[PDB]
Design a protein around this ligand. Structure first.
Ligand SMILES: [Mg+2]
Ligand SMILES: [Mg+2]
Ligand SMILES: [Mg+2]
Ligand SMILES: [Mg+2]
Ligand SMILES: [Mg+2]
Ligand SMILES: [Mg+2]
Ligand SMILES: [Mg+2]
Ligand SMILES: [Mg+2]
Ligand SMILES: [Mg+2]
Ligand SMILES: [Mg+2]
Ligand SMILES: [Mg+2]
Ligand SMILES: [Mg+2]
Ligand SMILES: [Mg+2]
Ligand SMILES: [Mg+2]
Ligand SMILES: [Mg+2]
Ligand SMILES: [Mg+2]
Ligand SMILES: [Mg+2]
Ligand SMILES: [Mg+2]
Ligand SMILES: [Mg+2]
Ligand SMILES: [Mg+2]
Ligand SMILES: [Mg+2]
Ligand SMILES: [Mg+2]
Ligand SMILES: [Mg+2]
Ligand SMILES: [Mg+2]
Ligand SMILES: [Mg+2]
Ligand SMILES: [Mg+2]
Ligand SMILES: [Mg+2]
Ligand SMILES: [Mg+2]
Ligand SMILES: [Mg+2]
Ligand SMILES: [Mg+2]
Ligand SMILES: [Mg+2]
Lengths: 103, 117, 58, 142, 48
RNA sequence: GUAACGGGGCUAAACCAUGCACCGAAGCUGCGGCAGCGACGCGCGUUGUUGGGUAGGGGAGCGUUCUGUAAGCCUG
């Protein structure tokens, strides 16, 4: 049993009990978040396709952590033209655990 | 006030020679050759963060084509008919279902065929 | 009174310097940008000047 | 959740047999290269070989339209100065008809170590018999 | 007030220019002089 | 050395006309982060907009040696 939802401009296919990393959500680090749009729910040969959303489908999760990702480096170079530049980046995320999915 | 460059210059070179590990020959041993290698590796990485988003959409599409022709339809008619039925699933999720749930993918192909009849 | 929709559909790179001044007099800034101007003969005459890169919805 | 990739120690392959009697040379050779590569499967992976084995029978009865039977020409160089050779389509059918099917397919495949291994799965015969009955090939209507 | 607690007023101690110390400074290489003239040489220029 | 379709090959997989689909960029949209300028309300908030760059002009910083604070502080 899995379900598909949209969060952060992206779409995810999750199953009950999984840990999924998303873009940052401004919610404290201990409580429940509800995803009330579900694109499709499949439960072993019974499939519910939403047009565009499944009627009354809810996914329940629970935030686990906040943090920053791994660092990347940006390098810009122009040969024979006396130009150089460098920069670093580190991106925020949010971790949730899928608790219950039901139509 | 005479200043000596010995201690600072050594640390400034060790930093570059550490990013060149695994390079062939003088590219991991000699500062002059290794400095150019590290700069070129950073140019490629910037360019290849854009191409990653292209090479993966190209692979999802070529994988939805093969699964749809097993069901009697082409990629272009499958994408056109899913938009007329108001389905909003993207290419990344579709290529996942095509491999792991062959029966759920057939339920989408029937959905897209009815919207074209 | 009554107003019209104006949208920009093409780029401004390589245009005559007098075509760029007409876009600034309407307020269009990029491809897909939409503005809200009122219907007068003076506004219409500067839509006609750049009609090849502009779309109107009355 | 990264995208699925196929593994060479796990891919399942099949055996097929096709005969090329009265079939256009270039429209037959396009379907052959599509299945030697694996593009007909939902598990296609560009760096892994996921195709099938194919037997091609009756290679000398293939067809070409127009005046290609006498006007199509095959060139190659021997590596010595002035060593440019040539032969016509009907000349090569009389000398070794197998090379005609294989030259067409090989040009439609990728170039490299993986493209070369794809070619090794093709078996072409000029007649109507083959000695691969223990692999149990099944009939494909390309 | 202590010998390690007095600081000057703001805007009175601007730092000077240093020429030819890399790309990031904005004054490296030619040092603000341009290319290949009489005015780019050492001691170069014309009288009043 | 084929060598005046990039190649295989094509009797359409060529050309003309009409139509509906889809692919395709660092363009546009979605989500997260940073900074410059301008307005309006009490440094802060809201709102609008901008951020490719050689010669060259403006602003802000890192680290090295030596003097005071220091007969202080750290250290077998
Ligand atoms: Mg000294
Ligand atoms: Mg070493
Ligand atoms: Mg893109
Ligand atoms: Mg591909
Ligand atoms: Mg355009
Ligand atoms: Mg310009
Ligand atoms: Mg035009
Ligand atoms: Mg993968
Ligand atoms: Mg992969
Ligand atoms: Mg020919
Ligand atoms: Mg290539
Ligand atoms: Mg001053
Ligand atoms: Mg400069
Ligand atoms: Mg210079
Ligand atoms: Mg000169
Ligand atoms: Mg000069
Ligand atoms: Mg002199
Ligand atoms: Mg004088
Ligand atoms: Mg010759
Ligand atoms: Mg071409
Ligand atoms: Mg269309
Ligand atoms: Mg393209
Ligand atoms: Mg942009
Ligand atoms: Mg656009
Ligand atoms: Mg934003
Ligand atoms: Mg700039
Ligand atoms: Mg110049
Ligand atoms: Mg600074
Ligand atoms: Mg400091
Ligand atoms: Mg001292
Ligand atoms: Mg000191």
């Amino acid at each position: 049993m899995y379900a598909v939802f949209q969060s952060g401009g992206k779409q995810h296919r999750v199953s009950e009990g999984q840990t999924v990393r998303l873009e940052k959500l401004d919610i404290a680090t201990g409580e429940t978040v509800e995803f009330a749009e579900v694109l499709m729910i499949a439960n072993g040969e019974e499939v519910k396709i939403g047009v565009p959303f499944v009627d009354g489908g809810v996914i329940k999760a629970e935030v686990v952590a906040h943090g920053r990702g791994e660092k990347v480096k940006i390098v810009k170079f122009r040969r024979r033209k006396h130009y150089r530049k460098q920069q670093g980046h580190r991106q925020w995320f949010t971790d949730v655990k899928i608790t219950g999915i039901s139509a | 006030a005479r200043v000596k460059r010995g201690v600072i210059a050594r640390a400034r070179h060790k930093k570059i020679l550490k990013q060149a590990k695994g390079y062939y020959g003088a590219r991991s041993r000699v500062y002059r050759v290794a400095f150019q290698a590290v700069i070129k590796a950073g140019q490629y990485a910037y360019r290849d963060r854009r191409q990653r988003k292209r090479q993966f959409r190209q692979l999802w599409i070529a994988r939805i084509n093969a699964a749809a022709r097993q069901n009697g339809i082409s990629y272009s008619k499958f994408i056109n008919g899913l938009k007329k039925a108001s389905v909003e699933i993207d290419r990344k999720i579709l290529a996942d279902i095509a491999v792991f749930d062959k029966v759920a993918f057939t339920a989408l192909v029937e959905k897209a065929k009815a919207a074209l009849a | 009174a009554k107003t019209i929709k104006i949208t920009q559909t093409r780029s401004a790179i390589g245009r005559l310097p007098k075509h760029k001044a007409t876009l600034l007099g309407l307020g269009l800034r990029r491809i897909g940008h939409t503005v809200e101007r009122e219907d007068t003969p003076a506004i219409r005459g500067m839509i006609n000047a750049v009609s090849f890169m502009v779309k109107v919805e009355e | 959740m990264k995208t699925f990739t196929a593994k060479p120690e796990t891919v399942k392959r099949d055996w097929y047999v096709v005969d090329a009697t009265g079939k256009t040379l270039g429209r037959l050779a396009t379907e052959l290269a599509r299945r030697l590569r694996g593009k007909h499967k939902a598990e296609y992976t560009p760096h892994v070989d996921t195709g099938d084995y194919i037997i091609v029978l009756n290679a000398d009865k293939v067809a070409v339209t127009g005046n290609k039977r006498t006007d199509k020409v095959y060139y190659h160089h021997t590596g010595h100065i002035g060593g440019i050779k040539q032969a016509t389509f009907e000349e090569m059918i009389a000398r070794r008809p197998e090379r005609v099917i294989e030259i067409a397919v090989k040009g439609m495949l990728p170039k490299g170590p993986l493209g070369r291994a794809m070619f090794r799965k093709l078996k072409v015969y000029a007649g109507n018999e083959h000695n691969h009955a223990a692999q149990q090939p099944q009939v494909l209507d390309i | 007030m202590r010998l390690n607690t007095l600081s000057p007023a703001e805007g009175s101690k601007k730092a000077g220019k240093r020429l030819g110390r890399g790309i990031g400074s904005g004054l490296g290489k030619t040092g603000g002089r341009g290319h290949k003239g009489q005015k780019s040489r050492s001691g170069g220029g014309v009288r009043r």
